[PDB]
Design an enzyme around this catalytic site. Structure first.
Site, short mmCIF file in Angstrom:
data_model
loop_
_atom_site.label_atom_id
_atom_site.label_comp_id
_atom_site.label_asym_id
_atom_site.label_seq_id
_atom_site.Cartn_x
_atom_site.Cartn_y
_atom_site.Cartn_z
N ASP A 57 0.77 -1.15 -0.04
CA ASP A 57 -0.06 0.01 -0.08
C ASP A 57 1.05 1.33 0.08
O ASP A 57 1.76 1.43 0.80
CB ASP A 57 -0.83 0.07 1.19
CG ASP A 57 -1.81 0.98 1.35
OD1 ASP A 57 -2.91 1.09 0.58
OD2 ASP A 57 -1.32 2.29 2.05
N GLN A 61 -2.76 3.86 4.65
CA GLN A 61 -3.97 4.00 4.77
C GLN A 61 -4.92 3.11 3.99
O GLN A 61 -4.68 2.85 2.84
CB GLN A 61 -4.36 5.45 4.57
CG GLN A 61 -3.54 6.46 5.35
CD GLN A 61 -4.27 8.00 5.17
OE1 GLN A 61 -5.36 8.19 4.88
NE2 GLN A 61 -3.23 9.02 5.04
N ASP A 138 -14.69 -14.65 14.64
CA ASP A 138 -14.84 -15.83 14.99
C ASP A 138 -14.66 -16.88 13.91
O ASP A 138 -14.23 -17.83 14.14
CB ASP A 138 -16.35 -16.37 15.64
CG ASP A 138 -17.61 -15.68 14.72
OD1 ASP A 138 -17.39 -15.25 13.64
OD2 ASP A 138 -18.73 -15.98 15.18
N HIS A 142 -11.75 -19.58 14.18
CA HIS A 142 -12.37 -20.83 14.19
C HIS A 142 -11.48 -21.67 13.29
O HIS A 142 -11.07 -22.62 13.64
CB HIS A 142 -13.96 -20.81 13.60
CG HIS A 142 -14.38 -22.13 13.05
ND1 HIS A 142 -15.21 -22.92 13.61
CD2 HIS A 142 -13.91 -22.75 12.16
CE1 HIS A 142 -15.49 -24.11 13.05
NE2 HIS A 142 -14.72 -24.21 12.01
N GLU A 143 -11.11 -21.07 12.08
CA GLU A 143 -10.27 -21.72 11.27
C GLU A 143 -8.82 -21.70 11.62
O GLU A 143 -8.21 -22.90 11.53
CB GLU A 143 -10.20 -21.28 9.81
CG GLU A 143 -11.60 -21.18 9.24
CD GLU A 143 -11.97 -22.71 8.88
OE1 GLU A 143 -11.06 -23.34 8.40
OE2 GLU A 143 -13.03 -23.22 8.82
N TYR A 157 -11.23 -35.56 10.72
CA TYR A 157 -12.45 -34.72 10.12
C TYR A 157 -13.75 -35.60 9.67
O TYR A 157 -13.98 -35.57 8.46
CB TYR A 157 -11.99 -33.78 9.39
CG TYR A 157 -12.92 -32.50 9.14
CD1 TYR A 157 -12.85 -31.48 10.44
CD2 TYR A 157 -13.62 -32.18 8.25
CE1 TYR A 157 -13.85 -30.54 10.12
CE2 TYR A 157 -14.47 -31.23 8.05
CZ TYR A 157 -14.42 -30.16 9.05
OH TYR A 157 -15.42 -28.92 9.22
N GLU A 166 -14.82 -29.53 14.59
CA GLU A 166 -15.54 -28.45 14.55
C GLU A 166 -15.94 -27.58 15.80
O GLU A 166 -15.86 -26.56 15.98
CB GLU A 166 -16.91 -28.88 13.99
CG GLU A 166 -16.75 -28.95 12.32
CD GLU A 166 -16.38 -27.66 11.76
OE1 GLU A 166 -17.02 -26.44 12.04
OE2 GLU A 166 -15.13 -27.30 11.18
N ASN A 183 -18.12 -7.40 19.45
CA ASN A 183 -19.52 -7.71 19.44
C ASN A 183 -19.96 -9.01 19.83
O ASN A 183 -20.30 -9.69 19.09
CB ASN A 183 -20.22 -7.30 17.99
CG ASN A 183 -19.91 -6.14 17.63
OD1 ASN A 183 -19.10 -5.74 16.73
ND2 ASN A 183 -20.58 -4.88 18.35
N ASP A 185 -20.98 -13.07 21.29
CA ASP A 185 -22.05 -13.73 21.10
C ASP A 185 -21.71 -15.01 21.08
O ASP A 185 -20.30 -15.30 20.94
CB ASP A 185 -23.11 -13.32 20.21
CG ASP A 185 -22.55 -13.19 18.72
OD1 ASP A 185 -21.64 -14.51 18.32
OD2 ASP A 185 -22.12 -12.07 18.32
N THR A 194 -25.20 -13.58 5.66
CA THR A 194 -26.63 -12.93 5.07
C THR A 194 -26.77 -11.24 5.24
O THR A 194 -27.27 -11.08 6.35
CB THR A 194 -27.74 -13.73 5.39
OG1 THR A 194 -27.66 -13.60 6.96
CG2 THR A 194 -27.73 -15.28 4.82
N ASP A 200 -29.36 -13.42 12.41
CA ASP A 200 -29.17 -14.61 11.80
C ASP A 200 -27.50 -15.20 12.08
O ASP A 200 -26.81 -14.38 12.50
CB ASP A 200 -29.76 -15.20 10.74
CG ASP A 200 -29.08 -14.38 9.59
OD1 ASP A 200 -28.53 -13.44 9.56
OD2 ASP A 200 -29.50 -15.08 8.46
N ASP A 226 -21.95 -34.42 4.93
CA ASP A 226 -21.20 -33.61 5.87
C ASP A 226 -20.02 -34.15 6.40
O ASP A 226 -19.87 -33.92 7.70
CB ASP A 226 -22.11 -32.62 6.77
CG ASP A 226 -21.32 -31.38 7.19
OD1 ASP A 226 -20.32 -30.84 6.92
OD2 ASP A 226 -21.78 -31.19 8.71
CA LIG Z 1 -27.35 -11.97 8.67
CA LIG Z 2 -19.91 -14.94 16.84
CA LIG Z 3 -3.77 3.29 0.95
ZN LIG Z 4 -20.27 -28.99 6.95
ZN LIG Z 5 -20.40 -11.43 17.37
ZN LIG Z 6 -14.30 -25.74 10.78
ZN LIG Z 7 -13.65 -24.95 7.68
ZN LIG Z 8 -16.44 -25.88 8.22
#
Ligand SMILES: [Ca+2]
Ligand SMILES: [Ca+2]
Ligand SMILES: [Ca+2]
Ligand SMILES: [Zn+2]
Ligand SMILES: [Zn+2]
Ligand SMILES: [Zn+2]
Ligand SMILES: [Zn+2]
Ligand SMILES: [Zn+2]
Ligand SMILES: [Cl-]
Ligand SMILES: [Cl-]
Ligand SMILES: [Cl-]
Ligand SMILES: [Cl-]
Ligand SMILES: [Cl-]
Ligand SMILES: [Zn+2]
Ligand SMILES: [Zn+2]
Ligand SMILES: [Zn+2]
Ligand SMILES: [Zn+2]
Length: 316
Positions: A57, A61, A138, A142-143, A157, A166, A183, A185, A194, A200, A226
């Site tokens: 960059d 900025q 998250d 998570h990953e 897995y 998982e 934030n 939760d 979404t 959701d 799955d």
């Molecule tokens: Ca959403």
């Molecule tokens: Ca979360």
């Molecule tokens: Ca820039």
């Molecule tokens: Zn899955």
């Molecule tokens: Zn959150």
């Molecule tokens: Zn995962």
């Molecule tokens: Zn994954």
């Molecule tokens: Zn996954």
């Protein structure tokens, strides 16, 4: 690259401003020298070639729309690093300060993100199902926790082991989200899923059945989809974890909550000391009970609450 450690500023996927650790050498690079062997963030330029180009960059900025996924991938990798170091005394995902490398703008309209064994990879979403996936702390954590699991227990897995895999990633993803006070939760992926639908997420740990996922072993999915239900049956363990932390009454079993820090310490010890590649739900219970025993004593409330929580979700 070699250069001068600097601090830039930008906006993430959700429009929030944050400072980022960069390196100056003609350009300002998304190279954070302050954490381990570095946090490095790359532009995949809508290709599937990895990692792509180290993000450069001109002015330090990062407020362009195209910058936003990179800002969050870089910043949230740093937060995840800080969580594991400061809370668990673990240095990066391998415990040996491995560099954390991330690529954003992977492919076109790609509704996914993943740890690939050596780096993080983030799609931008199609703008309807997902916005760019590094916008979810998250998701990032998570990953990266899948890498922690790979370097410790090696959970397979598929089937129950895979559902534990998982759920561990959902548990620490959530604990990172609380650690950051971003934030927080007990739902997963709410910040990037979404954009046209408020309230959701991909799944709920506090109430898996909100989205149809099982919250009791008697309701587990037993088919082959799955990978044997790894994102479905994780709700059983996710609810147990929620109960251990927050308490509650579930299928008539009352759990005395012990809080997030103790949840994290119990499950981190279980993951790193006791789980094996093929641990099933019953073996996870035993690992968590033993871990709480090691930490708090066999006659502790903490041990009693672990047992309560796994009873509540039908795991003996
Ligand atoms: Ca959403
Ligand atoms: Ca979360
Ligand atoms: Ca820039
Ligand atoms: Zn899955
Ligand atoms: Zn959150
Ligand atoms: Zn995962
Ligand atoms: Zn994954
Ligand atoms: Zn996954
Ligand atoms: Cl509930
Ligand atoms: Cl419930
Ligand atoms: Cl509850
Ligand atoms: Cl209930
Ligand atoms: Cl027990
Ligand atoms: Zn679902
Ligand atoms: Zn689900
Ligand atoms: Zn319940
Ligand atoms: Zn409940």
């Amino acid at each position: 690259i070699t250069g001068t450690s600097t601090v830039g500023v930008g906006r993430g996927v959700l429009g929030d401003q944050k400072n980022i650790n960069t390196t100056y050498s003609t350009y300002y690079y998304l190279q954070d020298n302050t954490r381990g062997n570095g946090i490095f963030t790359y532009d995949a330029k809508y290709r599937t070639t990895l990692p792509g180009s180290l993000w450069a960059d001109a002015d330090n900025q990062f407020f362009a729309s195209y910058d936003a996924p990179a800002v969050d991938a870089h910043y949230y990798a740093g937060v995840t690093y800080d969580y594991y170091k400061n809370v668990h005394n673990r240095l990066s995902y391998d415990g040996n300060n491995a560099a954390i490398r991330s690529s954003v703008h992977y492919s076109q309209g790609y509704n996914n993100a993943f740890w690939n064994g050596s780096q993080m990879v983030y799609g931008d979403g199609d703008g309807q199902t997902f916005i760019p996936l590094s916008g979810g702390i998250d998701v990032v954590a998570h990953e990266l926790t899948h890498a922690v699991t790979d370097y410790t227990a090696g959970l397979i897995y598929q089937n129950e082991s895979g559902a534990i895999n998982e759920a561990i990633s959902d548990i620490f993803g959530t604990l990172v989200e609380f650690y950051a006070n971003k934030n927080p939760d007990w739902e997963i992926g709410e910040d990037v899923y979404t954009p046209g639908i408020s309230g959701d997420s991909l799944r709920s740990m506090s109430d898996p059945a909100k989205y149809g996922d099982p919250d009791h072993y008697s309701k587990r999915y037993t088919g082959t989809q799955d990978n044997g239900g790894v994102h479905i049956n994780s709700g059983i363990i996710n609810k147990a974890a929620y109960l251990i932390s927050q308490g509650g009454t579930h299928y008539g079993v009352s759990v005395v909550g012990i809080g997030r820090d103790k949840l994290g310490k119990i499950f981190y010890r279980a993951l790193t000391q006791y789980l094996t590649p093929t641990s099933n739900f019953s073996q996870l219970r035993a690992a968590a009970v033993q871990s709480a025993t090691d930490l708090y004593g066999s006659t502790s409330q903490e041990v009693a609450s672990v047992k309560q929580a796994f009873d509540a979700v039908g795991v003996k």
